[PDB]
Amino acid sequence: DIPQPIRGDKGATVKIPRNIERDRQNPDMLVPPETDHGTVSNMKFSFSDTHNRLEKGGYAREVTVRELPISENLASVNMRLKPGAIRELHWHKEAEWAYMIYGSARVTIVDEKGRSFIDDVGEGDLWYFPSGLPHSIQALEEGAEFLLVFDDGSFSENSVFQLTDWLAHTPKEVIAANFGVTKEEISNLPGKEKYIFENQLPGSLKDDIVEGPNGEVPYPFTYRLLEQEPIESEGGKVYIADSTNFKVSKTIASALVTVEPGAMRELHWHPNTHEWQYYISGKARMTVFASDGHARTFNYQAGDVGYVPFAMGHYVENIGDEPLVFLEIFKDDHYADVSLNQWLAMLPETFVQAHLDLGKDFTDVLSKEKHPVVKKK
Amino acid sequence: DIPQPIRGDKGATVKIPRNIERDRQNPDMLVPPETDHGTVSNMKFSFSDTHNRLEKGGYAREVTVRELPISENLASVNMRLKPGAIRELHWHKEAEWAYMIYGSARVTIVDEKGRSFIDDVGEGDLWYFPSGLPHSIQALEEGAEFLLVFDDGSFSENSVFQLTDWLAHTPKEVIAANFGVTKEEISNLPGKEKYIFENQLPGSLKDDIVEGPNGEVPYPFTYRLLEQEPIESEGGKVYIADSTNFKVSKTIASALVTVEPGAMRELHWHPNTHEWQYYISGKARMTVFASDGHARTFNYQAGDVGYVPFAMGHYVENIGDEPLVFLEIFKDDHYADVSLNQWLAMLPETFVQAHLDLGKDFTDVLSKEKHPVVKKK
Amino acid sequence: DIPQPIRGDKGATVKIPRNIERDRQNPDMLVPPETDHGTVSNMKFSFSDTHNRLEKGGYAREVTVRELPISENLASVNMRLKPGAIRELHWHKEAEWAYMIYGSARVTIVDEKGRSFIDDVGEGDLWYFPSGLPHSIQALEEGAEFLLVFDDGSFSENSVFQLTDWLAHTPKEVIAANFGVTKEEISNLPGKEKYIFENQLPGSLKDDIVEGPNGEVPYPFTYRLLEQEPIESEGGKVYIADSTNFKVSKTIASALVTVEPGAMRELHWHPNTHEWQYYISGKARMTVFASDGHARTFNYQAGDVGYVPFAMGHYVENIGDEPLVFLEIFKDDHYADVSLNQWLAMLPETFVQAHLDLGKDFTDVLSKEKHPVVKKK
Amino acid sequence: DIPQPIRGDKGATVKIPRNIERDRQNPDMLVPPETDHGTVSNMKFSFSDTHNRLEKGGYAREVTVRELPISENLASVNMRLKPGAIRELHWHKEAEWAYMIYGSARVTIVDEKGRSFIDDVGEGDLWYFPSGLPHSIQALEEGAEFLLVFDDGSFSENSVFQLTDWLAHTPKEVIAANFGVTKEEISNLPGKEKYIFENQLPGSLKDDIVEGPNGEVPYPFTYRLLEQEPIESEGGKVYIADSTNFKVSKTIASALVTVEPGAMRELHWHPNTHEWQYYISGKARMTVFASDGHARTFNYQAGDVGYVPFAMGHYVENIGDEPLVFLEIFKDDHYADVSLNQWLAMLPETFVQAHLDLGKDFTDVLSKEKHPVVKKK
Amino acid sequence: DIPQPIRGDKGATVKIPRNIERDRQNPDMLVPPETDHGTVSNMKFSFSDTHNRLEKGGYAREVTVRELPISENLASVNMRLKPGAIRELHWHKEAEWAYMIYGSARVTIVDEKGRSFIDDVGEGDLWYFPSGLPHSIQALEEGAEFLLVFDDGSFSENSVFQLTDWLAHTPKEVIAANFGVTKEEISNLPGKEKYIFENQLPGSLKDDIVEGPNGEVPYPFTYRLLEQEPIESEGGKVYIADSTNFKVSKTIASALVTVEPGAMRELHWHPNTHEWQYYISGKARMTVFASDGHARTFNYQAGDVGYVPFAMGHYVENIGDEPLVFLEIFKDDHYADVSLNQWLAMLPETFVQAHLDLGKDFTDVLSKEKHPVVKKK
Ligand SMILES: [Mn+2]
Ligand SMILES: [Mn+2]
Ligand SMILES: [Mn+2]
Ligand SMILES: [Mn+2]
Ligand SMILES: [Mn+2]
Ligand SMILES: [Mn+2]
Ligand SMILES: [Mn+2]
Ligand SMILES: [Mn+2]
Ligand SMILES: [Mn+2]
Ligand SMILES: [Mn+2]
User: How far, in Å, CA of C2 to CA of C21, rounded?
Assistant: First the structure.
């Protein structure tokens, strides 16, 4: 049945040709809360609304500042590899964070000391490659699909440094001299980058491990986020990974949040930096509060990127029947938040009472323990 | 049936939760043309993906640079008034262009010489209010729904100058002194802006006309675009309105394009400025060609804003069953384009032949007459 | 008696209408030193020349980059609370530093671990709230007046995040769900921010202290600057507070300087960052030396903000009859300066002699001990 | 013999490895005039110091803001075509100005009204293609070498819009539909841009001329600069071409200056805009005077680009044995200059005398007639 | 013999007046590698192409962002002092790094604690003065010539803070008061900066050392780079100095590289920051690879500054008969690089094989030990 932008006696029927399907996806936007007010930048964008780069062995599509101007510090790729397919050995200026949503893959990485690290990554695992270190991904028997996050919003999947593209653009004489071979011995180097290519499934991880004169890396570039004990509350759970626990992960701080139906990520903000969001599954609404009485509510579902500017107040409410599952990303060495609840709970009852024009009956429910996700009892 | 991002042996099935509805709306994006390549900014955005401001008597929602960063020079509002509802008397820095999609409305405007202009606007009509001149809209018995375009992408519907908001923020003594009345005589001024408000239907246009010491305005601020004889070709028609014919319309140049099914707005570019697009009805695809072999294809349908950076090559192909109807907007005193066809048609056969590695059989079909929209005979 | 901009045979009488009162306040500007030269940005601005925001229970006025463009990194509020008046619970992006000039007040603050800190602040005390942590001020029986400094010059007192303003702009359903109460139980929440409001005087500090599951904060957010032993010299004293001693105070470094009549803050610069100044009492002049022989002298008195760009040479001379008292603020984790005197004192006599075309009689007076404020013996 | 940076008792011998060849080319830079002073941006750059793009049939190298940051408004290409070689049909955002130094070539251009213009260009001729209009160059039996100037310093020869590159990046179906042919009929379109390619010499100009439904262009896009009577003075001559005489040339104003040995382009400035310079032959020095007593002298010879910021005082002195020949380019609809000489000549003798502390003997030589190039009698 | 920009059947003879001398210096630019492609910023600039500031006792010339826009973070001075000549006591915002190419000199520096450090510096030695600390240089009996690097590309040698220039622009009364002398006692202070001046040779270093109330500096501001054991490979050696070994050197990381004829600095990049280069002696070529298949080759020799943007792939090949010697500078607390060779050497043979379409015969030569400079055996 057709929704209309009408709230009480405000609003009216749409009379011109419209996108009913999207109107349906965005109820709190066709009909915002009465408490919404003023202008805020766009805080939502769908991967389905982006050009998809198709290759032999997979695909990559991106959400960058070119799509979502508010996110100047952070950009993202949704990438897919078919079984055995290789995302070509490459590097880039930006540091890279990743979450494996579907399947598994082997990654390689070499650090600035000539040490290589090679690991398999399963669903619910992260990896993090520091700025400038060369790496690669190769999916296993199930193939693989994942989210990449880069710590610069100007990033583009099409302007990364590929191994073969470097070679093809280096004088043969110089390549030959570099390795001490003849020109002929390298006559067959690719004349073009590969980016993503089909390849036979890799062997066992153990058969791949390369030891060297310089020894093991100090710290691993992969982390089993879902093997961690989550912060658990009534309405759901939160799995945090930042530099304090996922050691190499210096420029990216993360939390995977799961929200039961009827639950919600509570009212809070972040006193460190901006929040970048990706929605893995479910349906949500968020109101971002930007001060000076400016406030706007966005709807999100699977494949949607979201965003909360530094310190803006928000909440994430599950408005669907299925679990709501999303990521919280920050460009920072740690996760941090202030809970509205915990905050007031830690101040004198009467002081809070004087602020809210409410009484004991309200301050009584305040809780000093933090519960990031609560249920609608 | 479910679409997948697969083209020949490139691409793969989506394995993670997805937005199938949007995937369906964007076929040429889930599966771009093989000839697409490289990165281009986002050139498409839907009004359905924006917060809608609901008032008593209508609504307004906007697409600004905050949503579509590529469009720094141009922004847009989709506004709706219920019958008799008034968009409050107001002004702003930006010049304003408008197209009446549904219904009709009376507008008023006063110029820098103290001359007022008052007209009724029907479907297919435009108006254009020069930077800084105060105006208002009032819908008639059918109500009204229209598109507004402003010649600065930083524009926001929420930061316009409203009559009552000015007064409420002016010292009463000063207001009283200004008009030579007492404070009491204006005690009842609104304490708040109205923005949009319900009101009884207006009388006849003739009963409203105000004459003054300074006489008629030199030129009208409304234009009957659809009363013009269109440039007509096989596949459809083009109705142009720019400063050369719609005289006051100095900073905005416009064309309403209608494209029969199986037809297409031909291959061309614009040698003056950027193109801002709004899609009134139908389904389309456009490829924007950005040089250095960069090219990207976007899908559009009703409620969608589009965009082509200065001189980028494009075409607009109807890929639907119904007529395709859209606006072309420029920040310029005239419309202008170069037709690929007409271009080659006006050069030596053999010269063109030498360029395209084709022969007479191709140059023979070239046409020196411009046909902006052609059919698939 | 009327001052004129005449120096020897340079300058002339003012012949047009003028501001004699200001001319009097700015002697070294109507008549600069002969050694002044070239253009420098404006380095002085008076709080008396700003719009004052008046509320029930106090006032706030600000000096931001909008008033003093040279100060891009730092901005300031002069705030006043009547006895018992509360500056509403709030937070903001910027970190906040403070100096209590008159009276006293209770502050509260909660950190990112859900720990609250509550303290009373008297004259000559500082507080420092890290970016993003929620806080509040409540004046005691004497009321309170203080200076706030924020580590971004784009700061505005009117765009802070207020508790009640957040709530009023959050859907009631969501608020209710957040705390697990009914809509009715919060029906009486303020429909508007309070910002500053009248309230009964608070109880004892001890009765207010809130303990919690997470324990005491590691470090206090208040510092008794005047209880410290000052660096004392002949002409006056300097009380420094930076991250090395006021531990939480990571982004702001400070010094309160007192200068007897006939004394002066010596010739120096700062090799770390810019200097932001506030003048609490007295009359001063400063010459800022900007290299390339550019130099300009400014006059300052109570209520005046001043400023010295990174590494520019300066001095602060008391030119009044009463003590001169001012603050030195830096956006940095430590205070640091180079004394011209100490500098030359630590180099070979003859080397210095060769530089200044002076002799032993001059190098003899140089001192290796730093004396930040000297007297005119 | 080896030059050293020594002037009187200032300076010293170079003691580290050096570029003697360049030192020789830059005498007034190794050893500037005593009257030089302070910092000025770099005002000189050599085409020999740029990467040269080599193609089949010629080459192109550029000087852009990426090489010469002071020139933000203007950039340049030095292009070379072998006999019959075609610079591929193309267009771009920037307007283009040109001077034929060696040989000749046929150009084509189509305007926004579908009118084509086709002309042959010889040595000493200019052309000017307005922003966005498609064009091409084809050298004749002698081949051709010329200078291109573009009215944006961000221009790059590698990011122009090529005909074939557009087609190769347009869906075949869409191309086919555009022209009403089959896919097969265009199967043989180039899969890649050509940029510059070898081709047989063109026929007579008359055999190439294409008439059309829309008639002759209003004005020609080529101008015989050297067929004009030059402003002639003792030391040389000046050939000006701007919008007042070369009608289409709206955004570019030009002058070809020839300076006999012992002569010099007199002391002057330009009260409209910046000056961009190219040196065709000879050796010169220029001092640019930037006010605040800042002044710097540059040496120039064949292949060198130069530059004078808006209104900066300068002169161009021939310091070689051969004629000095260079271009003066402006981004403006007209050429204009103020002659120092003419200026003083038009003011009261005694007034000028009072300024320069000279007497009648000096004012007597002043001349009211402008002589842009004077000789050292 | 005359070089021409011809490669196989690409390119053509230059037909217009040209700079053959530079053409000769830039072989890989007149005739780039076939593998070069696309646009890159300018990465090369010669000190011989700059205005030289001549003083009594030496000279200074600079390469700043005003000459080389790509280098926004880093600028450089080539300075020369005659025996006993003093670069006047001064300070500046920027931190300063230095390499002594010819001769020796005494430097002085005072830190923020009033501690002075005084040392003699010989060929192959570095010094590093932290932002804002006052210093000076005085050459010994041989005179001195060195390279200075400053950690801001906007730096200008003409806008430094000089001791005497400060004094001359400070009111005499204030100077007198500062030191507690009379105006007369300082009547003879220079009325102008000195910048560089002639002076008698200094005594022994030991006679100059100044002790003070505050003791020795924690760490020395000079470092004997060439006394270190170099990383030595077949083709040459690398001497690294960064914050890990040259302790005070916090914002600048450095390496002196020497390359035998027939050798080359291997294929690598830097995963931390940009590379700024200075060429001390020899002839080289470098190709910088900028991704998206963009690549450009530059020629360098003595007196040339070079540059590699963050993470761009490069190599430095000696193309001369004499040793090639150059500096690598970074704005960072450590040196770091990734070797292409070492990188592939640390990954599974077959994985690498699958990337390069080569076989065992190639992976066999890969080496896990890093060899920064290799020879053409
Ligand atoms: Mn990557
Ligand atoms: Mn959050
Ligand atoms: Mn309007
Ligand atoms: Mn168009
Ligand atoms: Mn605050
Ligand atoms: Mn100071
Ligand atoms: Mn062109
Ligand atoms: Mn000129
Ligand atoms: Mn220095
Ligand atoms: Mn390197």
Answer: 10
Q: Quick check: do B and C touch, 3+ CB pairs under 8 A? A: no
CB within 8 Å: A356 and C189: yes
- CA pair distance A249, A238, nearest whole angstrom: 18
A317 and C174 within 8 Å at the Cβ level: the answer is: yes
Is A198 marked active-site?
A: no
The answer to whether the B1-50+225-377 and B51-224 domains have the same CATH topology is: yes
Tokens for E186? Answer: 């300082």
- Give the ranges where chain D is alpha helix by DSSP (H): 20-25, 27-30, 163-167, 172-179, 340-345, 349-356, 360-363
Overall residue count recorded for chain E in this entry = 377
List C-alpha distances in Å: A184 to A165, A166, A172, E340, E366.
19, 18, 9, 20, 17
Please report, for chain D, the start and end positions of each structural domain, with discontinuous segments joined by +.
1-50+225-377, 51-224
Residue whose C-alpha is closest to residue C77's, from C51, C103, C57: C51
Give the whole-angstrom CA distance, residue A106 versus residue A203: 10
Query: H-helix or E-strand containing D362?
Result: helix D360-363
User: CB-based contact (8 Å) between C182 and chain A?
Assistant: no
What's the token pair of residue A374? Answer: 């609560």
Tell whether A294 is in a known binding site: no
Of A29, A42, A82, the CB nearest to B66: A42
Cβ atoms < 10 Å from Cβ of E217? 15
Tell me the two tokens of residue D111.
Answer: 């305007």
CATH class of D1-50+225-377: mainly beta
Distances (CA, A) of D339 to D311, D349, D372: 12, 17, 8
* 3-state secondary structure (DSSP) of residue E22: helix
Contact A161 E351 (CB under 8 A): no
Residue that has been written with the tokens 């014919």 in this structure: B245
Contact criterion met (CB below 8 Å) for E42 and E68: yes
The answer to whether the beta carbons of residues A80 and A58 sit under 8 Å apart is yes
| CB C291, CB C299: distance < 8 Å | no
Task: Count each helix (H run) and each strand (E run) in chain C, helices first.
Answer: 7, 26
Query: Ligand 5 centroid to C128 CA: how many Å?
Result: 10
Q: How was this structure determined?
A: X-ray
CA distance D27 to D33: 10
Resolution of this PDB entry, in A?
A: 2.3
Helices (H), A142-219: 163-167, 172-179
Single out the catalytic residue among E62, E185, E328, E349: E328
Comparing C-alpha atoms, which of B92, B105, B341 is closest to residue B201? B105
Q: Any bridge partners for residue C59, and if so which?
A: C54, C80
DSSP secondary-structure letter at C313?
Answer: B
CA of A241 to the centre of ligand 2 (A): 14
State the Cα torsion A294-A299-A301-A305 to the nearest 10°. -30
Provide the 8-state DSSP code for E37: B
**How many Å lie between the alpha carbon of E273 and the closest alpha carbon of chain D?**
20
By CB atoms closer than 10 A (0-12, 13-18, 19+), residue B49 is buried
Tokens read off for B300: 């559009």
Fold exhibited by the domain E51-224: Jelly Rolls (2.60.120)
Structure tokens at E309: 């943007």
Is C274 marked within a binding site? no
* Cβ-based burial of E311 (10 A; exposed 0-12, middle 13-18, buried ≥19): buried
3 state SS of E257: strand
> Which ligand does the CA of C274 lie closest to?
6
**Integer angstrom CA distances of residue A269 from A277, A372, B193, E161:** 14, 11, 31, 45
Which among E231, E346, E349 is the top mutation candidate for probing chain A, defined by the most A β-carbons within 10 Å of its own β-carbon? Answer: E346
User: In this structure, are strands C324-330 and C58-63 parallel, antiparallel, or unpaired?
Assistant: unpaired
Distances from the Cα of A29 to the Cα of A41, A112, A314, B77, E136, angstroms: 14, 48, 16, 15, 65
